[PDB]
Amino acid sequence: PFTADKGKCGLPEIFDPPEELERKVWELARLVWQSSSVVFHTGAGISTASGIPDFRGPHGVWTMEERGLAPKFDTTFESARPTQTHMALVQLERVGLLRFLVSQNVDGLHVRSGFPRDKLAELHGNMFVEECAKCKTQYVRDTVVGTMGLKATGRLCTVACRGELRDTILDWEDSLPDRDLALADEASRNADLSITLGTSLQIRPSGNLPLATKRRGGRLVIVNLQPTKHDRHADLRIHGYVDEVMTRLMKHLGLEIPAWDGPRVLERALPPLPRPPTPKLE
Ligand SMILES: Nc1ncnc2c1ncn2[C@@H]1O[C@H](COP(=O)(O)OP(=O)(O)OC[C@H]2O[C@H](O)[C@H](O)[C@@H]2O)[C@@H](O)[C@H]1O
Ligand SMILES: NC(=O)c1cccnc1
Ligand SMILES: [Zn+2]
């Protein structure tokens, strides 16, 4: 806990000049159109524009701790709204352009955005989610489950069980959920495109999953304001706000960013909605 390595914190931000940003978001669109299997990896950087500080940003939880200062939350976890980027990822799964979504984020927001849980890996867990120790049944709650570290929340299982319910919030020592990690690992290896959004990729094994796509000729796009552990390995790096990149990308793909009806849980991905015909590339 005190000893835990929190990695490189507070590296300087990179801003791609606009001409270059526009050109890289078009090239990202090109790659989305050519890819059979797209997997998105997300970290704290996709929720900063909803008021949730990241970990290793200029005002990161870890960076501010390092400087003897406090992270600042502009929302509770319960009053946070999925960002343009969250709602862009909902649509890309709905139209068949997102195979799987791997997330380090415990903020609940991919679940609350209406993103289907059967295509989401929550590698570090979810604040709103508690799991029955006996039957492994997961409960998506409307408030944060009060504990962190895989402790008893004090509620019991209601499966037609009285099993101890526990939080899914891994402590520093805790191995990742075998199911989420197994499914994140498979999707990553099979992907011909892995796009990272607002993660520095500093945590093993989460941060290495995108690199798995590079085996057997897959492409890696890293979208981040700061440098990331695996920048060297990226076919494309885009230094800009994830909301600007995803809003420009959607525009290029001819998809609207859908309305957030408020907190809603989808367990299972639906059949793909219709999407625009693909452009002529070569
Ligand atoms: N609007 C933005 N647009 C683009 N990038 C952004 C934005 N805001 C922040 N970033 C970038 O987003 C990146 C976020 O990097 P980190 O803060 O390490 O988040 P993680 O999810 O990878 O942290 C992994 C685990 O570490 C912890 O121990 C927990 O267990 C976490 O789950 C930064 O490089 C920012 O520059
Ligand atoms: N977005 C997140 O999941 C998160 C949670 C706690 C602290 N910083 C970020
Ligand atoms: Zn149970």
PDB file of N, CA and C in Angstrom, residues 35-70:
ATOM      1  N   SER A  35     -10.544  -3.025 -40.307  1.00  0.00           N
ATOM      2  CA  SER A  35     -10.413  -4.019 -39.209  1.00  0.00           C
ATOM      3  C   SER A  35     -11.654  -4.909 -39.093  1.00  0.00           C
ATOM      4  N   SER A  36     -11.429  -6.224 -39.034  1.00  0.00           N
ATOM      5  CA  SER A  36     -12.440  -7.269 -38.755  1.00  0.00           C
ATOM      6  C   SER A  36     -12.893  -7.206 -37.293  1.00  0.00           C
ATOM      7  N   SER A  37     -11.959  -7.021 -36.352  1.00  0.00           N
ATOM      8  CA  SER A  37     -12.168  -7.194 -34.892  1.00  0.00           C
ATOM      9  C   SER A  37     -11.484  -6.040 -34.143  1.00  0.00           C
ATOM     10  N   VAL A  38     -12.253  -5.018 -33.747  1.00  0.00           N
ATOM     11  CA  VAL A  38     -11.705  -3.839 -33.013  1.00  0.00           C
ATOM     12  C   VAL A  38     -11.954  -4.021 -31.510  1.00  0.00           C
ATOM     13  N   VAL A  39     -10.906  -3.877 -30.701  1.00  0.00           N
ATOM     14  CA  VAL A  39     -10.967  -3.912 -29.214  1.00  0.00           C
ATOM     15  C   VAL A  39     -10.460  -2.569 -28.695  1.00  0.00           C
ATOM     16  N   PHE A  40     -11.238  -2.014 -27.792  1.00  0.00           N
ATOM     17  CA  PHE A  40     -10.948  -0.729 -27.142  1.00  0.00           C
ATOM     18  C   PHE A  40     -10.505  -1.019 -25.707  1.00  0.00           C
ATOM     19  N   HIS A  41      -9.388  -0.433 -25.319  1.00  0.00           N
ATOM     20  CA  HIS A  41      -8.887  -0.432 -23.920  1.00  0.00           C
ATOM     21  C   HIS A  41      -9.063   0.961 -23.335  1.00  0.00           C
ATOM     22  N   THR A  42      -9.721   1.087 -22.194  1.00  0.00           N
ATOM     23  CA  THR A  42      -9.935   2.412 -21.552  1.00  0.00           C
ATOM     24  C   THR A  42      -9.387   2.439 -20.121  1.00  0.00           C
ATOM     25  N   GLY A  43      -8.874   3.614 -19.749  1.00  0.00           N
ATOM     26  CA  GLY A  43      -8.332   3.944 -18.422  1.00  0.00           C
ATOM     27  C   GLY A  43      -8.938   5.255 -17.953  1.00  0.00           C
ATOM     28  N   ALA A  44      -8.407   5.801 -16.861  1.00  0.00           N
ATOM     29  CA  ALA A  44      -8.997   6.939 -16.133  1.00  0.00           C
ATOM     30  C   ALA A  44      -9.169   8.151 -17.049  1.00  0.00           C
ATOM     31  N   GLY A  45      -8.348   8.302 -18.096  1.00  0.00           N
ATOM     32  CA  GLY A  45      -8.352   9.503 -18.955  1.00  0.00           C
ATOM     33  C   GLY A  45      -9.681   9.737 -19.652  1.00  0.00           C
ATOM     34  N   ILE A  46     -10.472   8.696 -19.894  1.00  0.00           N
ATOM     35  CA  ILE A  46     -11.816   8.842 -20.533  1.00  0.00           C
ATOM     36  C   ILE A  46     -12.871   9.378 -19.543  1.00  0.00           C
ATOM     37  N   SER A  47     -12.593   9.576 -18.242  1.00  0.00           N
ATOM     38  CA  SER A  47     -13.646  10.050 -17.298  1.00  0.00           C
ATOM     39  C   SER A  47     -13.307  11.401 -16.654  1.00  0.00           C
ATOM     40  N   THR A  48     -12.143  11.971 -17.014  1.00  0.00           N
ATOM     41  CA  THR A  48     -11.666  13.294 -16.538  1.00  0.00           C
ATOM     42  C   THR A  48     -12.663  14.370 -16.970  1.00  0.00           C
ATOM     43  N   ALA A  49     -13.275  14.243 -18.148  1.00  0.00           N
ATOM     44  CA  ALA A  49     -14.198  15.292 -18.643  1.00  0.00           C
ATOM     45  C   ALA A  49     -15.584  15.136 -17.996  1.00  0.00           C
ATOM     46  N   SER A  50     -15.817  14.099 -17.184  1.00  0.00           N
ATOM     47  CA  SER A  50     -16.996  13.948 -16.275  1.00  0.00           C
ATOM     48  C   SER A  50     -16.713  14.370 -14.818  1.00  0.00           C
ATOM     49  N   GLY A  51     -15.503  14.863 -14.507  1.00  0.00           N
ATOM     50  CA  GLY A  51     -15.117  15.428 -13.199  1.00  0.00           C
ATOM     51  C   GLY A  51     -14.334  14.442 -12.348  1.00  0.00           C
ATOM     52  N   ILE A  52     -14.105  13.226 -12.847  1.00  0.00           N
ATOM     53  CA  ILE A  52     -13.295  12.204 -12.135  1.00  0.00           C
ATOM     54  C   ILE A  52     -11.825  12.380 -12.494  1.00  0.00           C
ATOM     55  N   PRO A  53     -10.969  12.679 -11.501  1.00  0.00           N
ATOM     56  CA  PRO A  53      -9.556  12.896 -11.790  1.00  0.00           C
ATOM     57  C   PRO A  53      -9.015  11.528 -12.243  1.00  0.00           C
ATOM     58  N   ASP A  54      -8.022  11.537 -13.121  1.00  0.00           N
ATOM     59  CA  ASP A  54      -7.248  10.302 -13.415  1.00  0.00           C
ATOM     60  C   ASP A  54      -6.238  10.001 -12.299  1.00  0.00           C
ATOM     61  N   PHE A  55      -5.343   9.042 -12.534  1.00  0.00           N
ATOM     62  CA  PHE A  55      -4.328   8.646 -11.527  1.00  0.00           C
ATOM     63  C   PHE A  55      -2.978   9.368 -11.777  1.00  0.00           C
ATOM     64  N   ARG A  56      -2.446   9.391 -13.012  1.00  0.00           N
ATOM     65  CA  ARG A  56      -1.046   9.800 -13.276  1.00  0.00           C
ATOM     66  C   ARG A  56      -1.022  11.019 -14.201  1.00  0.00           C
ATOM     67  N   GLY A  57      -2.145  11.738 -14.324  1.00  0.00           N
ATOM     68  CA  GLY A  57      -2.231  13.045 -15.013  1.00  0.00           C
ATOM     69  C   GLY A  57      -1.556  14.171 -14.239  1.00  0.00           C
ATOM     70  N   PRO A  58      -1.400  15.382 -14.828  1.00  0.00           N
ATOM     71  CA  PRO A  58      -0.889  16.523 -14.066  1.00  0.00           C
ATOM     72  C   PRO A  58      -1.580  16.715 -12.701  1.00  0.00           C
ATOM     73  N   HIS A  59      -2.914  16.529 -12.642  1.00  0.00           N
ATOM     74  CA  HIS A  59      -3.755  16.551 -11.409  1.00  0.00           C
ATOM     75  C   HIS A  59      -4.285  15.148 -11.059  1.00  0.00           C
ATOM     76  N   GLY A  60      -3.529  14.099 -11.405  1.00  0.00           N
ATOM     77  CA  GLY A  60      -3.804  12.689 -11.044  1.00  0.00           C
ATOM     78  C   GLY A  60      -3.844  12.443  -9.535  1.00  0.00           C
ATOM     79  N   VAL A  61      -4.636  11.441  -9.098  1.00  0.00           N
ATOM     80  CA  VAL A  61      -4.748  10.965  -7.683  1.00  0.00           C
ATOM     81  C   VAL A  61      -3.319  10.720  -7.179  1.00  0.00           C
ATOM     82  N   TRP A  62      -2.557   9.825  -7.835  1.00  0.00           N
ATOM     83  CA  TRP A  62      -1.136   9.515  -7.521  1.00  0.00           C
ATOM     84  C   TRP A  62      -0.213  10.737  -7.676  1.00  0.00           C
ATOM     85  N   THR A  63      -0.315  11.510  -8.757  1.00  0.00           N
ATOM     86  CA  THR A  63       0.528  12.722  -8.969  1.00  0.00           C
ATOM     87  C   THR A  63       0.318  13.717  -7.818  1.00  0.00           C
ATOM     88  N   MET A  64      -0.927  14.013  -7.447  1.00  0.00           N
ATOM     89  CA  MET A  64      -1.221  15.017  -6.388  1.00  0.00           C
ATOM     90  C   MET A  64      -0.710  14.468  -5.044  1.00  0.00           C
ATOM     91  N   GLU A  65      -0.969  13.198  -4.735  1.00  0.00           N
ATOM     92  CA  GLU A  65      -0.404  12.517  -3.538  1.00  0.00           C
ATOM     93  C   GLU A  65       1.125  12.713  -3.474  1.00  0.00           C
ATOM     94  N   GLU A  66       1.820  12.557  -4.611  1.00  0.00           N
ATOM     95  CA  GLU A  66       3.302  12.647  -4.717  1.00  0.00           C
ATOM     96  C   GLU A  66       3.751  14.056  -4.321  1.00  0.00           C
ATOM     97  N   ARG A  67       2.975  15.074  -4.703  1.00  0.00           N
ATOM     98  CA  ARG A  67       3.294  16.510  -4.483  1.00  0.00           C
ATOM     99  C   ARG A  67       2.708  16.994  -3.149  1.00  0.00           C
ATOM    100  N   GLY A  68       2.276  16.081  -2.276  1.00  0.00           N
ATOM    101  CA  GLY A  68       1.588  16.392  -0.999  1.00  0.00           C
ATOM    102  C   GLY A  68       0.266  17.133  -1.196  1.00  0.00           C
ATOM    103  N   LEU A  69      -0.459  16.869  -2.283  1.00  0.00           N
ATOM    104  CA  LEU A  69      -1.744  17.560  -2.599  1.00  0.00           C
ATOM    105  C   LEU A  69      -2.837  16.519  -2.768  1.00  0.00           C
ATOM    106  N   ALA A  70      -4.081  16.955  -2.977  1.00  0.00           N
ATOM    107  CA  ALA A  70      -5.264  16.071  -2.995  1.00  0.00           C
ATOM    108  C   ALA A  70      -5.817  16.104  -4.408  1.00  0.00           C
TER     109      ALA A  70
END
